[PDB]
Amino acid sequence: MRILVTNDDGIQSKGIIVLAELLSEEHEVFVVAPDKERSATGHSITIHVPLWMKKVFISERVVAYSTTGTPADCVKLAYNVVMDKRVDLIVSGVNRGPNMGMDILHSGTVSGAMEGAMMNIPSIAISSANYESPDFEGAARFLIDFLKEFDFSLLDPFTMLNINVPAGEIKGWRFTRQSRRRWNDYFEERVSPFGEKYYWMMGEVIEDDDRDDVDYKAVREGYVSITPIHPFLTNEQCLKKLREVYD
Amino acid sequence: MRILVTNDDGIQSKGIIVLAELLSEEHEVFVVAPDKERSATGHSITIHVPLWMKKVFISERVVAYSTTGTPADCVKLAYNVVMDKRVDLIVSGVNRGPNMGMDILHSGTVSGAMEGAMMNIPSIAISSANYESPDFEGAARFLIDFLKEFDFSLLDPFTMLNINVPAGEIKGWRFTRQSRRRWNDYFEERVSPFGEKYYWMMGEVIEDDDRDDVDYKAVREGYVSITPIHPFLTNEQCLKKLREVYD
Ligand code: VO4
Ligand code: VO4
Ligand SMILES: [Ca+2]
Ligand SMILES: [Ca+2]
Ligand SMILES: [Ca+2]
């Protein structure tokens, strides 16, 4: 397969390097990633200014470039100016840290894969669920094994797989639904040298999902969480009720 | 919905034309069919040489392409190259003549639909059960109506519907099982101008199925035969016996 590999931690992250190398053992791998820290950038794109690319070195057989854009920008550039519009699979990661629940909306890792979904290209976002002690090779190894056991015809149009791999011992994997895991954010106030106050964003996690098949619960149990997600945010149930009340 | 229409007689067949046109009245239809005769081609596919496609005209409303491949090749090409992996339904037909019993293994019509089933795409193989005097419109009209009343969520994984429509009167439809209808075939031997003998395959049909709910019996009684089939040939009964006998 012609695979495009990107991430949000920069082309110099161990997470993307390990992943790119392993996939190159049996696939035509191309790497187009950000040249800096792009975490928490969500699905932002660059349209007001020019985008720049730089050919870098990852390992022979692997064509790589760094860009001044976001993960989503990287996928757009890779598709049109690097891969001749021929991409069989996109893998964004391996991210250092989990991307579950509502946090996926501000996730740069997920955004890369989601841009692929928007372009209707099979895409996967993969994250190592332990920021403090990530396991990049383990997550990449899981992906290799997963590909040999996953039927992409079952991945609907415009859909991607958001994968979270537990750092410890993998007991297995489960197809999950996105949880409503979110945060009760708050700010710590401080004062600058020039007397102006500033704020640091902090927060306490909220894990109150009642369903057992949600992402974080599987990861918590030592299972890889695999959620099929797509760029369609319509709340169907709400729309149906709204249409019943308003004619 | 996005429907892929194909067949095994050729993109210039009256059976596929009538079907595409009628379906294009309410759906976005794409036609990808063989550029020549493909009856009796079974589930063959092209892997040793390249495949080619040609844009052709069928109706100012349908996107059509002929290919140098088999019916199964047509579906693969349609799904991966023409329809951008966006196929809601696959309809192979309307074939001139029945496709029942063991003949479905040699059927190019069934093969196209089976390729769809293998990708878990709702698929239908449809034939007008009368080679001599077929009724393409009647079969097509039946399908249109069938699509408005059948719930495809009832189709198990990897399962397609093999449909045979009576050429005369359609008293109604009934779910059937594949029969063991086959042929007492032999060869008509002849001699060429250069003294070498050649063989013409010939045969008389065999209808000796005792079961009452088989395909040809339904068609014979004026009912549309609808058989749910899948790509699994294991003889469970026999497997059970051989197991309890040896090991
Ligand atoms: O670092 V993420 O933006 O992909 O959590
Ligand atoms: O022409 V068939 O191969 O589908 O009887
Ligand atoms: Ca990150
Ligand atoms: Ca035919
Ligand atoms: Ca025979």
Instruction: Please give the single-letter amino acid code of residue A207.
Output: E
Q: How far is B177 from chain A (nearest CA, A)?
A: 27
d(CA B40, CA B25): 31
| Alpha-carbon separation of residue B176 from B112, B212, B229 (angstroms) | 20, 9, 10
DSSP codes of every residue in chain B: -EEEEE-SS-TT-HHHHHHHHHHTTTSEEEEEEESS--TT-TT----SS---EEEEEEETTEEEEEESS-HHHHHHHIIIIISTT--SEEEEEEEES---GGGGGT-HHHHHHHHHHHTT--EEEEEES-SSS--HHHHHHHHHHHHHH--GGGSPTT-EEEEEE-SS---EEEE-B----EEEEEEEEEE-TTS-EEEEEEEEEE-----SSBHHHHHHTTEEEEEEE-S----HHHHHHHHHH--
CB-ligand 2 contact for B109 (6 Å cutoff): yes
User: Do residues A190 and A116 lie in contact, with contact meaning Cβ atoms separated by under 8 Å?
Assistant: no
For tokens 């996730």, the residue is A107
User: Do residues B162 and B110 lie in contact, with contact meaning Cβ atoms separated by under 8 Å?
Assistant: yes
What are the tokens at B110? Answer: 């069934």
d(CA B85, CA A67): 29
User: Do residues B169 and B47 lie in contact, with contact meaning Cβ atoms separated by under 8 Å?
Assistant: no
Minimum-distance CB partner of A157 among B86, B118, B119: B86
Instruction: Give the list of residues 6+ apart from residue A122 with CB closer than 8 angstroms, or none.
Output: A88, A89, A90, A116, A152, A155, A160
User: Do residues A24 and A1 lie in contact, with contact meaning Cβ atoms separated by under 8 Å?
Assistant: no
User: Do residues A80 and A69 lie in contact, with contact meaning Cβ atoms separated by under 8 Å?
Assistant: no
CB-ligand 2 contact for B108 (6 Å cutoff): yes
Could you tell me which of A90, A66, A61 has the C-alpha nearest to residue A11? A66
Cα angle A6, A74, A31; round to 5: 40
Q: Which run of H or of E encompasses A243?
A: helix A236-245
Helix count (H) and strand count (E) of chain A?
6, 11
Q: Which of B82, B85, B118 to mutate to test the interface with A (most CBs of A within 10 A)?
A: B85
DSSP codes of every residue in A32-90: EEESS--TT-TT----SS---EEEEEEETTEEEEEESS-HHHHHHHIIIIISTT--SEE
| Alpha-carbon separation of residue A49 from A45, A73, A93, A115, B222 (angstroms) | 10, 12, 26, 19, 69
For tokens 């190592």, the residue is A128
Chain B residues close to A117, C-beta within 8 Å: none
Q: Which run of H or of E encompasses A164?
A: strand A160-165
The widest CA-to-CA distance across chain B, in whole angstroms, is 63
Chain B residues close to A157, C-beta within 8 Å: 84-86
Residues of chain A whose C-beta is under 8 A from some C-beta in B?
Answer: 120, 151, 153-154, 157
| Second-level CATH architecture of B1-247 | 3-Layer(aba) Sandwich (3.40)
Minimum-distance CB partner of A120 among B84, B118, B119: B84
Q: Ligand 2 pocket test: pick from B36, B102, B107 the residue with the most ligand atoms within 8 Å of its Cβ.
A: B107
The widest CA-to-CA distance across chain A, in whole angstroms, is 63
The secondary structure of chain A in percent helix, strand, coil, rounded to multiples of 5, reads 30, 30, 40
Instruction: Give the list of residues 6+ apart from residue A208 with CB closer than 8 angstroms, or none.
Output: A180
Phi then psi for residue B22, to 5 deg, are -60, -40
Instruction: Give the list of residues 6+ apart from residue B181 with CB closer than 8 angstroms, or none.
Output: B100, B101, B102, B103, B205, B206, B207, B209, B214, B215, B216
CB-ligand 2 contact for B164 (6 Å cutoff): no
- Secondary structure letter of residue A25 according to DSSP: T
What are the tokens at B215? Answer: 């395909």
What are the tokens at A16? Answer: 């993307």
8 Å CB contact of A157 and B85: yes
Q: How far is B24 from chain A (nearest CA, A)?
A: 22
d(CA B227, CA A244): 39
d(CA A176, CA A216): 9
User: Do residues A159 and A176 lie in contact, with contact meaning Cβ atoms separated by under 8 Å?
Assistant: no
- Secondary structure letter of residue A147 according to DSSP: H
Distance from residue B8's CA to the centre of ligand 4 (Å): 5
Would you call the peptide bond into A82 cis, given omega within 30 degrees of 0 as the criterion?
A: no
Helix axes B14-23, B136-149, angle to 10 degrees: 40
Which long-range contacts (C-beta less than 8 Å, at least 24 apart) are formed by A83-89? A83/A2, A83/A4, A83/A30, A86/A2, A87/A2, A87/A3, A87/A4, A87/A116, A87/A121, A88/A1, A88/A2, A88/A3, A88/A121, A88/A122, A89/A1, A89/A2, A89/A3, A89/A4, A89/A121, A89/A122, A89/A123, A89/A124, A89/A152
Instruction: Please give the single-letter amino acid code of residue B201.
Output: M
| Alpha-carbon separation of residue B216 from A72, A173, B181 (angstroms) | 56, 46, 8
Would you call the peptide bond into A18 cis, given omega within 30 degrees of 0 as the criterion?
A: no
Q: Count of CB atoms within 10 A of residue A167's CB?
A: 19
Q: Which run of H or of E encompasses A96?
A: strand A89-96
Instruction: Give the list of residues 6+ apart from residue B82 with CB closer than 8 angstroms, or none.
Output: B30, B32, B53, B63, B65
d(CA A26, CA B26): 44
Is the Cα dihedral A58, A60, A62, A67 positive or negative? positive
d(CA A155, CA A137): 25
Residue ranges covered by each domain of chain B: 1-247
Resolution expressed in Å: 1.9
Residue nearest to atom 4 of ligand 1 (CA): A109
